[PDB]
Amino acid sequence: TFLTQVKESLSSYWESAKTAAQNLYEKTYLPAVDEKLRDLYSKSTAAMSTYTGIFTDQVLSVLKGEE
DSSP, rough: OOOHHHHHHHHTTTTTHHHHHHHGGTTTTHHHHHHSSSSSSSSSHHHHHOHHHHTTTTHHTTTTTTO
């Protein structure tokens, strides 16, 4: 109800973060991946994510199995 309105706003900035994600993600966050996506993480949760290999597996399962 009242949350639906904000949902239009709180989401108006959630759709952008994705619009400018696949863009930079293409360069493997080079600008600071070696000093952030490898140094500011220290495999803290990089190996736990691996989304890089599930980005399509998580969606490919949606076609059947909602996995």
